[PDB]
Design a protein around this ligand. Structure first.
Ligand SMILES: CC[C@H](C)[C@H](NC(=O)[C@H](C(C)C)[C@@H](O)[C@H](O)[C@H](CC1CCCCC1)NC(=O)[C@H](Cc1c[nH]c[nH+]1)NC(=O)COc1cccc2ccccc12)C(=O)NCc1ccccn1
Lengths: 99, 99
């Protein structure tokens, strides 16, 4: 699939059985999903963007299915207005930006 | 041509003469830059993201040349740590995210 940028490129993902809507963001190093339950093997981290810095919960190799394709990749939880899917998953899926 | 997400998709643009390193971001509704003196032709505004809000000077019809294409578009000025090229500029050059 092609992606028009006329609308926000929001697609729906299943984060390990848990369905969730995420934004394909090529200006994110990482992926931040709010309120999903991923467990116990976490490490707190802080992320940054334009208003400042947020505190997160880093989980590794979680399983993810999006655009009907599979992946295991780092997942950071936090207080984000939207679930962002950054470059770490975009590469995993083989996504690109074309002019 | 084409771009991978291995590395930040950062490009060299020229906003009315002045060259700058910009991030191609499908996750921004708007474009924001710093260290560029546009003029006393603006409207002020509050754009938000991770970490909260920031204030900007909004400037309509600015001319840009990036990746061999010339376009005219709104550009916001403010305290962004990295210059940003949002969806307003992506659709002006005919870029898309594909899989
Ligand atoms: C750390 C991971 C994280 C994803 C991070 N990057 C960013 O946040 C990107 C850059 C500033 C670097 C940023 O453009 C990004 O993609 C974010 C992510 C955003 C989170 C909120 C939900 C929607 C998406 N986009 C943005 O910040 C753009 C900026 C903008 C332009 N016009 C108006 N606003 N925001 C938007 O388009 C408006 O989004 C919103 C959508 C829905 C609700 C919202 C509620 C409140 C605020 C925003 C909402 C990064 O890698 N940063 C590297 C870095 C940071 C600091 C210092 C050095 N390096």
């Amino acid at each position: 699939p092609q992606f028009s940028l006329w609308k926000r490129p929001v697609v729906t993902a299943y984060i390990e059985g848990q369905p969730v809507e995420v934004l394909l963001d090529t200006g994110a190093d990482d992926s931040i999903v709010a309120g999903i339950e991923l467990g116990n093997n976490y490490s707190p981290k802080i992320v940054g963007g334009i208003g400042g810095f947020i505190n997160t919960l880093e989980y590794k190799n979680v399983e993810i299915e999006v655009l009907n394709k599979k992946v295991r990749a780092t997942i950071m939880t936090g207080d984000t207005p939207i679930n962002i899917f950054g470059r770490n998953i975009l590469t995993a899926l083989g996504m690109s930006l074309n002019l």
